[PDB]
Write a protein that binds this ligand. Structure first.
Ligand SMILES: CCCCCCCCCCCCCCCCCC(=O)OC[C@H](COP(=O)([O-])OCC(O)COP(=O)([O-])OC[C@@H](COC(=O)CCCCCCCCCCCCCCCCC)OC(=O)CCCCCCCCCCCCCCCCC)OC(=O)CCCCCCCCCCCCCCCCC
Ligand SMILES: CCCCCCCCCCCCCCCCCC(=O)OC[C@H](COP(=O)([O-])OCC[N+](C)(C)C)OC(=O)CCCCCCCCCCCCCCCCC
Ligand SMILES: CCCCCCCCCCCCCCCCCC(=O)OC[C@H](COP(=O)([O-])OCC[N+](C)(C)C)OC(=O)CCCCCCCCCCCCCCCCC
Ligand SMILES: CCCCCCCCCCCCCCCCCC(=O)OC[C@H](COP(=O)([O-])OCC[N+](C)(C)C)OC(=O)CCCCCCCCCCCCCCCCC
Ligand SMILES: CCCCCCCCCCCCCCCCCC(=O)OC[C@H](COP(=O)(O)OCCN)OC(=O)CCCCCCCCCCCCCCCCC
Ligand SMILES: CCCCCCCCCCCCCCCCCC(=O)OC[C@H](COP(=O)(O)OCCN)OC(=O)CCCCCCCCCCCCCCCCC
Ligand SMILES: CCCCCCCCCCCCCCCCCC(=O)OC[C@H](COP(=O)(O)OCCN)OC(=O)CCCCCCCCCCCCCCCCC
Ligand SMILES: CCCCCCCCCCCCCCCCCC(=O)OC[C@H](COP(=O)(O)OCCN)OC(=O)CCCCCCCCCCCCCCCCC
Ligand SMILES: CCCCCCCCCCCCCCCCCC(=O)OC[C@H](COP(=O)(O)OCCN)OC(=O)CCCCCCCCCCCCCCCCC
Ligand SMILES: CCCCCCCCCCCCCCCCCC(=O)OC[C@H](COP(=O)(O)OCCN)OC(=O)CCCCCCCCCCCCCCCCC
Ligand SMILES: CCCCCCCCCCC1=C(C)C(=O)C(OC)=C(OC)C1=O
Lengths: 98, 105, 347, 70, 169, 314, 80, 57, 48, 110
């Protein structure tokens, strides 16, 4: 298939493996999650514009909006973590081992 | 559990965006409208198990419309053979493929 | 929380799951999962302590990752099929990604690592919602895509879930982690019979929801979250020890109880398809689940652990908690096996 | 008095007058003494590329009228 | 070379993701995701998605990454080898992808990909006096009733959810 | 030939921003019963030149930056966005005639808060970071009413095309059907550019105080380019002039006079009012402008339908 | 119903104007005689090509030419 | 049939060129000046062309 | 004023769209001959 | 294409002016300065209210993104449904603003 889809899928996998390998910050995790969403937006958009499927042109906007609301919720969770420990470090979130 | 509320109540919540061949605004067709209409009219009602083996031709034509893999493979082959023959000097492109022909209309 | 806001948020959780159940477009499937997650996050942060925020953060990260993999599976389906019907998928890569995403949502092993944490971090009512209501929407999507699910993947996820949920509960004393590893083992049992007979998948889901709702309702009515506080129940309410006895003996699947009903039916559908090793090893692995159920029954019903003196004060006060449907759920989770051919209503 | 501010306003107004006057004269210079063809929609671009093909000089704005037919 | 331009943007797009997926700091990672959003917007714009590309600017970049950078600047108090090694690893894997799919005009990582410029897959007609993508987004109010209801309800509930969980009571 | 057109756009932008500083000092002079600059040039016409040469040979302030890269990027982004807001402006013909020029300007103005945010974080001062967060929150707050007012006006236009907005106003100014939208729009553009009475970066530290005289002058000229641009955009949007297509300079003279009067109205508003407190302009947005803006957005949706006055798409 | 209204118009005229304009936007298109013409003008706008019909022989309402009498007319739009 | 279109258009324009070439030329020149090719800018040249065609054809 | 002028603008839009409609058969015939010209040239050069 | 040329020209002129403003007074040899804020060294205290106004911006910006195709959506032939859903979206933005009001979310930055 087309050549641009290779790069958009590879971008989704790069943002996947960034989201699946945390370093320290939860904000960097949320950025990798939104990179995954952005690559999904681009890939859906290039397909729907290519196929001239008219009714799905409203589809990526929807894919934006919900997920950005999702991002808002994630930011709020991070802030609550930051209001407990002072930092958004993922190693502070280890109390549920016992 | 596929509680088919939409067919039960007769409402149309999301069937309209489901396929490319549905009713579109301003009657805009998809690029693979005809192939998808033929694949759907083939595979309608007979179930998925029969639809995989009995409607393989329409589905392969529709997938090759969607992604154009055989078409781009053929264009790869023709362009590669043309570039090889240009490198060998055994071929020359015509004036209408070099941009010297004063286009049609 | 404002009770009106609690009602609207629980109706939004239910609305998300119902939108997953009734929709014919993959975008509305993804929207129902997003609405479900977005609305269930305040149910987990109901008490506002750092364990609830940690649990909600872990729950958000796992469900968000599964939602992104779900949308990538949907988008690859749109690549290779040019449409959006919630039916079989038209690519084994999209089928693998959707099976992984739904295994992450269900918390099936090896994507199980959030389930005993999050259930520990949240109250008993929100843990009840997470272990009963949050299974319904991904099992509906797995119900509708089973002509595309890889057999080796779904059975690998099933046996890995059953074994890890068996060994995980043996080391626990916290009741919520026991119910979470019980959840992982029972989801393994549900997905092991999915490609053979999904009516038995629905049967196992319904009997599991009844038994889990009974055990969480007993834990809420006795206000016990640990084994050793559940062992004070005989000196406070002796009927509740009988109820946790019969319900834990049901959840292990001992006949003549109704929790013997699903797994037996699952074996009844896996030997028709010439699989003998797999349901036998599954049934032998479920003895671990029954072992830590027996540990809880020895702590609670069949012995009497020592109590404290202040228990004598609680003797003067009856339970004012609304023990909603607890006799109904207790009867249904124990005495339903003579009505086993009722399962045809799920066909 | 107050008209002392008018030289700076005049300078600034000439500086705001320059871009539109410049783009109007450049559009009339680059497009045969006429406006630039506005092609917001693909039909307008189709007509414009047809004009470029029927002009014969690879310029869309060179218009051919009734003298180009017999 | 200019026939490959969207492909070229996509390469930069992948490079931008190796910017923030390697996670240098959430603020440089925010900057890398902003640059990635701009070039992915350019990819969208070069197929004819004008409105969707301006949604990438106005709503993803100007709407959401503003809030990411805003929240991030209220943490990570102002003033690696794993980041640099991860960045050069992702860059070398991407340039090996480029080298293979340009030397062969075909590659297969998971799916088979043609190596021609992505101009070849387009349509050779006109859409008349409308953008088809604009009319498909305009159909959200005429054909997308259930989609509008569930999206607006999810946004209202999202307002309620953020106000419940950020209160601590 | 197109590069000449780009230069004749963007060099007169810099000259008009240069002499807007003189016009501001003079007009604020006479409104304060004094004179403005009249010594340095004849009538003070050499004051911006002298001030530019002074600022570009002043000592670099040399800060310790938390990030060198974003400290460089924030003036670059500010000037690039302040120059790209001009290219779809139909005066009478835009440099870049695009179909979605209104949404393009709304997007490129939504990107302008990153210069404030990056310059605030790139400084080591925490109080400068607090001021940057307040300025960003102010700007993104008033962008909401920008977008909704702008949508409610373009419901009478038919498209996002800026050149169509001249055709829309051939019979009447669009300030007549939309003067409440015009007045909330005008105060929202006053609050976008951090302009008085909304200038809390000078109310008692600015986000860009760690920059040297050169780069702070670049921020300053990007701000005044935004001011002139938003006044031109408000002129195009509500006070659209007569356009003879055979004589485009009539439209150029007319929108130039109206945009000058609107920029002087910015100058005359800063000579008249005290500042808001920060919560008070938050109260102005969220509790006053936004309910009226939503109500008028409902009104301007339903009004072309109930009067059969839906504008054409093309 | 009248003292409360003068009270809220004395205290909060921004919100009274907001709810009043919103109420007019809700109720007034159902009371307008010109809402019908918005629909009629949007369906009179020919974005697509008028794909002609094969003359079977019995279609008395379909014209053979644009300047024929039968067919949909736009006298109401030119007159109003 | 397409050739018939391309045969019937030319007979359309020749019959303009035989009779009313100059009002048509002035009219499409005035149409041609506009970058959107407005009909509303050119109503008097349109009126002259319509008058000349209605009288002579 | 916006009522009268937008109704005039809708009538002018219909006049432009009917000019387009009257021109679409000629453009469709030319487009068909255009694309068949290009496909025949591609076929002949593929043959050689 | 002309847009990309114009963006490159604007970005290049901005980068040139920033380079001149950062390197023209570096040529002078003025003096070395030793040079040894309202908060001294206290860590930046987090404001919940700035985060809430930014999230309220984000959610209303998503609702605006839904509202943006209305000048195109008015051209439809299903105008009763279009008008109903347009009024419903603006009404749900108003209900979001009202709930943000009544639970004191718009307070001390009102
Ligand atoms: C069909 C599926 C039905 C699913 C269950 C629906 C009800 C439960 C869900 C909602 C809930 O919790 O309601 C409370 C719930 C009682 O649960 P509870 O609070 O735990 O019970 C404690 C005492 O009942 C508390 O007693 P009280 O002192 O407060 O007042 C006495 C109360 C007073 O009752 C009333 O006031 C009811 C009359 C008014 C109703 C509303 C009118 C408006 O009597 C009862 O409620 C008697 C209990 C009746 C049984 C409840 C379960 C019904 C059967 C569920 C399915 C069983 C299937 C078995 C199949 C096995 C083989 C597969 O239900 C009621 O109060 C009404 C029951 C009506 C049953 C109708 C069944 C046929 C429907 C057609
Ligand atoms: C574009 C060209 C220029 C446009 C015009 C602008 C020129 C004038 C500018 C003057 C300088 C302003 C400097 C900044 C001022 C900031 C302060 C300020 O004004 O705040 C806004 C003030 C705020 O008021 P406030 O805050 O003082 O009021 C107190 C409010 N409470 C009680 C909550 C504390 O007013 C508004 O918000 C109104 C905005 C415009 C409203 C327009 C309404 C039009 C009429 C609608 C219909 C009414 C009748 C009812 C329905 C009938 C139906 C038939
Ligand atoms: C377009 C916007 C405006 C553009 C910029 C303004 C236009 C004019 C720019 C050039 C002005 C002259 C050079 C900069 C000013 C020098 C001031 C100064 O203190 O110089 C002393 C400095 C240093 O002299 P110094 O050795 O006496 O150092 C003084 C400091 N002590 C003694 C303590 C070490 O002079 C220079 O650096 C010379 C710079 C080059 C001279 C001019 C070259 C040609 C320019 C064209
Ligand atoms: C609260 C929601 C109130 C408004 C509901 C929709 C009103 C409306 O105009 O519906 C007509 C519209 C469109 O109907 P229509 O009459 O325009 O359909 C004609 C066919 N098309 C669309 C092809 C032109 O929606 C429906 O009829 C079905 C979707 C909504 C079904 C009800 C959902 C309720 C959810 C409650 C939770
Ligand atoms: C096989 C699957 C993975 C293939 C790609 C591997 C890329 C190179 C990374 C290998 C692991 C290096 C490492 O140490 O990662 C750990 C790091 C998080 O750990 P941290 O706390 O930063 O450091 C302690 C050191 N372990 O983790 C990271 O920083 C990982 C960030 C990954 C981002 C992906 C970028 C693109 C990679 C290539 C394409 C895939
Ligand atoms: C194919 C199948 C399709 C779908 C079919 C239907 C599936 C139904 C799945 C049921 C899932 C139930 C989820 C949990 C209940 C949801 C509401 C809730 O949160 O209730 C708990 C509530 C909280 O009150 P609170 O005060 O917070 O309690 C803590 C102490 N202060 O109140 C309490 O704590 C009160 C204590 C008792 C609560 C008992 C609730 C039991 C609900 C489940 C009943 C059994 C399932 C229904 C029958 C079988 C259906 C398959
Ligand atoms: C779109 C339009 C934009 C227009 C922008 C500009 C607006 C303002 C225009 C200029 C206004 C008048 C300028 C007068 C400058 C001062 C001239 C003067 O008198 O300088 C005297 C000084 C010393 O003279 P000296 O001989 O020593 O005196 C003793 C005599 N017995 O001698 C000197 O200082 C030496 C000579 C210096 C001359 C400088 C002249 C001014 C430079 C202006 C630059 C811009 C010009 C216009 C650009 C756009 C049009 C091309
Ligand atoms: C090869 C030989 C040249 C070498 C390189 C030099 C390049 C040209 C530089 C400008 C001309 C050189 C002379 C500069 C001024 C010297 C004379 C002077 O200072 O005259 C004073 C006179 C006003 O007298 P004053 O002392 O102010 O008295 C107060 C009133 N009672 O002052 C005046 O009347 C006004 C003086 C104005 C100075 C010139 C105008 C400004 C500079 C314009 C060009 C550079 C900037 C271009 C634009 C930058 C961006 C805005
Ligand atoms: C920190 C990094 C540096 C920061 C400073 C510099 C970047 C920020 C300032 C510049 C922002 C660049 C914006 C580029 C796209 C703008 C949107 C756009 O193209 O809209 C115009 C137009 C849409 O209208 P329409 O008329 O429908 O389309 C033509 C159809 N006849 O569409 C067109 O005309 C399409 C023209 C062809 C496609 C253009 C693609 C541009 C290149 C890719 C994006 C470049 C910016 C990347 C970085 C963003 C910011 C980080
Ligand atoms: C039905 C049409 C659609 C309606 C929905 C769409 C409306 C568009 C505008 C959006 C407004 C969004 C925000 C609304 C919030 C309302 C609640 C509120 O503000 O309550 C508090 C307020 C007192 O203010 P306070 O809390 O003290 O704040 C400090 C300022 N003094 O309390 C008050 O000021 C009391 C406010 C309620 C009374 C307003 C009465 C207006 C009546 C106008 C005539 C009738 C119009 C028809 C609609 C019915 C209205 C009831
Ligand atoms: C490319 C550079 C062009 C010239 C520089 C901008 C025009 C001159 C503005 C001078 C100026 C004035 C009058 C000024 O008053 C001021 O202080 C508020 C500034 O900011 C530091 C200024 O920059």
């Amino acid at each position: 298939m087309s050549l641009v889809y290779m790069n958009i899928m590879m971008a989704f996998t790069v943002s996947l493996t960034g989201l699946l390998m945390y370093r320290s910050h939860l904000m960097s995790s949320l950025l990798c999650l939104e990179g995954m969403m952005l690559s999904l937006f681009i890939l859906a958009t290039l397909m729907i514009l290519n196929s001239h499927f008219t009714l799905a042109s409203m589809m990526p906007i929807i894919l934006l909006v919900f997920a950005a609301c999702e991002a808002a919720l994630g930011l709020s969770l991070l802030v609550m973590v930051s209001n407990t420990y002072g930092t958004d470090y993922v190693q502070n979130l280890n109390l549920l081992q016992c | 559990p596929f509680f088919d509320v939409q067919k039960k109540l007769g409402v149309d919540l999301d069937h309209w965006m489901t396929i490319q061949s549905a009713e579109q605004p301003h009657r805009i067709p998809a690029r693979c409208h005809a192939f998808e209409k033929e694949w759907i009219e083939c595979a309608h009602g007979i179930g998925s198990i029969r639809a995989e083996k009995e409607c393989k031709i329409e589905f392969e034509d529709f997938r090759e419309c969607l992604l154009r893999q055989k078409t781009m493979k053929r264009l790869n082959a023709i362009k590669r053979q043309r570039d090889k023959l240009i490198k060998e000097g055994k071929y020359t492109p015509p004036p209408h493929h070099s941009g010297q022909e004063d286009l049609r209309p | 929380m404002n009770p009106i806001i609690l009602i609207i948020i629980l109706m939004t959780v239910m609305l998300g799951t119902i939108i997953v159940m009734i929709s014919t477009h993959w975008l509305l499937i993804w929207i129902g999962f997003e609405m479900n997650m977005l609305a269930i996050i305040p149910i987990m942060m109901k008490k506002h302590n750092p364990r609830a925020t940690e649990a909600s953060t872990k729950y958000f990260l796992t469900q968000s990752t599964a939602s992104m993999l779900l949308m990538m599976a949907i988008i690859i389906n749109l690549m290779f099929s040019g449409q959006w019907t919630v039916m079989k998928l038209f690519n084994p890569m999209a089928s693998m990604l959707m099976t992984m995403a739904l295994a992450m949502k269900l918390g099936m092993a090896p994507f199980h690592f959030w389930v005993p944490e999050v259930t520990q971090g949240i109250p008993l009512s929100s843990g009840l919602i997470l272990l009963t209501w949050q299974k319904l929407a991904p099992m509906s999507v797995l119900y509708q895509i089973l002509p595309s699910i890889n057999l080796d993947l779904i059975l690998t996820l099933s046996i890995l879930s059953i074994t890890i949920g068996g060994w995980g509960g043996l080391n626990q004393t916290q009741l919520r982690k026991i119910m979470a590893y019980s959840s992982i083992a029972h989801m393994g049992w549900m997905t092991a019979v999915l490609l053979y007979n999904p009516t038995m998948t629905l049967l196992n889901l319904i009997i599991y929801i009844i038994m889990t709702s009974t055990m969480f309702t007993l834990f809420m009515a006795n206000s016990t979250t640990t084994t050793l506080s559940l062992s004070h129940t005989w000196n406070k309410a002796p009927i509740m020890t009988i109820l946790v006895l019969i319900t834990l003996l049901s959840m292990g699947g001992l006949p003549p109880l109704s929790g013997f009903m699903p797994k037996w039916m699952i074996i009844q559908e896996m030997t028709k398809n010439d699989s003998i090793i797999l349901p036998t090893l599954m049934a032998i692995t479920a003895l671990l689940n029954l072992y830590f159920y027996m540990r809880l029954t020895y702590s609670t019903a069949l012995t009497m652990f020592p109590s404290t003196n202040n228990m004598k004060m609680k003797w003067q006060f009856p339970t004012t908690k609304r023990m909603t449907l607890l006799p109904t759920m207790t009867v249904l989770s124990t005495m339903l096996l003579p009505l086993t051919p009722i399962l045809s209503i799920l066909e | 008095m107050w008209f002392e501010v008018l030289p700076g306003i005049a300078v600034m107004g000439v500086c705001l007058f320059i871009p539109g006057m410049a783009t109007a004269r450049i559009h009339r210079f680059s497009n045969g003494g006429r406006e630039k063809r506005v092609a917001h929609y693909s039909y307008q671009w189709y007509l414009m590329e047809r004009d470029r093909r029927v002009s014969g000089v690879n310029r869309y704005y060179v218009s051919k009228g009734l003298e180009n037919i017999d | 070379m200019m026939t490959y331009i969207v492909f070229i943007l996509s390469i930069i797009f992948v490079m931008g993701f190796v910017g923030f997926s390697s996670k240098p700091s959430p603020i440089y990672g925010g900057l890398g995701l902003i640059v990635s959003g701009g070039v992915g917007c350019g990819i969208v714009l070069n197929f004819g998605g004008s409105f969707l590309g301006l949604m990438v600017f106005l709503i993803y970049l100007g709407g959401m990454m503003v809030v990411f950078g805003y929240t991030t600047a209220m943490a990570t108090e102002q003033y690696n080898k794993v980041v640099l090694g991860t960045f050069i690893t992702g860059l070398l894997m991407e340039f090996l992808m480029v080298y293979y799919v340009l030397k062969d005009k075909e590659v297969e990582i998971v799916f088979k990909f043609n190596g021609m410029g992505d101009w070849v897959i387009y349509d050779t007609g006109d859409s008349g006096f409308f953008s088809e993508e604009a009319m498909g987004i305009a159909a959200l109010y005429s054909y997308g009733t259930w989609l509008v209801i569930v999206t607006g309800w999810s946004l209202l509930i999202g307002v309620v959810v953020i106000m419940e969980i950020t209160r601590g009571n | 030939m197109f590069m000449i057109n780009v230069l004749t756009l963007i060099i007169p932008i810099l000259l008009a921003v240069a002499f807007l500083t003189l016009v501001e000092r003079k007009v604020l002079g006479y409104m304060q019963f004094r004179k403005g600059p009249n010594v340095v040039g004849p009538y003070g016409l050499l004051q911006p030149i002298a001030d530019a040469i002074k600022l570009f040979i002043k000592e670099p302030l040399r800060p310790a930056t938390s990030s060198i890269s974003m400290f460089i990027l924030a003036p670059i982004l500010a000037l690039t966005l302040a120059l790209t807001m001009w290219i779809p402006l139909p005066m009478p013909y835009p440099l870049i005639n695009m179909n979605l020029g209104v949404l393009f300007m709304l997007a490129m103005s939504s990107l302008a808060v990153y210069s404030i945010l990056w310059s605030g974080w790139a400084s080591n001062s925490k109080y400068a970071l607090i001021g940057a967060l307040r300025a960003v929150a102010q700007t993104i707050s008033y962008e909401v009413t920008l977008a909704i007012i702008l949508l409610s006006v373009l419901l009478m236009n038919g498209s996002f095309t800026l050149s169509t907005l001249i055709i829309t106003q051939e019979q009447v100014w669009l300030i007549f059907p939309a003067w409440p939208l015009a007045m909330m729009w005008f105060i929202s553009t006053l609050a976008e550019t951090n302009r008085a009475p909304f200038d809390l970066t000078e109310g008692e530290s600015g986000f860009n105080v760690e920059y040297a005289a050169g780069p702070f002058a670049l921020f300053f000229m990007a701000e005044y380019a935004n001011i002139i641009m938003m006044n031109i955009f408000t002129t195009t949007l509500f006070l659209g002039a007569f356009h003879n297509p055979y004589m485009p300079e009539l439209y150029t003279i007319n929108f130039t006079i109206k945009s000058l009067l609107l920029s002087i109205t910015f100058l005359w508003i800063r000579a008249s009012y005290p500042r808001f407190r920060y919560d008070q302009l938050m109260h102005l947005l969220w509790k006053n402008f936004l309910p009226l803006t939503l109500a008028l957005c409902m009104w301007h949706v339903s009004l072309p339908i109930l009067l059969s006055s839906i504008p054409p798409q093309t | 119903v009248a003292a409360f209204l003068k009270n809220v118009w004395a205290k909060e005229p921004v919100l009274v104007a907001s709810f009043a304009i919103a109420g007019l936007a809700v109720i007034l298109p159902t009371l307008s005689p010109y809402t019908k013409y918005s629909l009629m003008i949007n369906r009179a706008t020919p974005y697509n090509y008028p794909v002609p019909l094969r003359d079977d022989g019995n279609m008395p309402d379909v014209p053979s030419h644009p300047q024929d009498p039968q067919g949909p007319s736009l006298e109401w739009l030119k007159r109003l | 049939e397409g050739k018939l279109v391309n045969q019937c258009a030319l007979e359309f324009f020749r019959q303009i060129k035989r009779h009313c070439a100059e009002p048509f030329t002035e009219y499409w020149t005035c149409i041609d000046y506009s970058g959107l090719q407005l009909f509303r800018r050119c109503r008097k040249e349109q009126a002259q062309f319509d008058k000349c065609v209605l009288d002579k054809l | 004023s916006m009522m009268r002028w937008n109704r005039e603008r809708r009538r002018l839009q219909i006049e432009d769209f009917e000019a387009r409609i009257a021109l679409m058969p000629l453009l469709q015939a030319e487009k068909d001959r255009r694309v068949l010209q290009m496909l025949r040239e591609n076929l002949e050069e593929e043959a050689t | 294409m002309n847009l990309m040329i114009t963006l490159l020209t604007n970005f290049t002129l901005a980068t040139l002016l920033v380079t001149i403003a950062f390197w023209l007074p570096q040529l002078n040899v003025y003096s070395e300065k030793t040079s040894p804020d309202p908060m001294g060294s206290a860590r930046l205290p987090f404001s919940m209210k700035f985060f809430l106004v930014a999230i309220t911006f984000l959610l209303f910006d998503l609702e605006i993104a839904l509202l943006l195709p209305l000048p195109w959506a008015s051209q439809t032939t299903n105008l009763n449904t279009m008008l109903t859903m347009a009024l419903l979206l603006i009404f749900l933005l108003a209900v979001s603003l009202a709930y943000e009001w009544t639970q004191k979310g718009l307070e001390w930055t009102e």
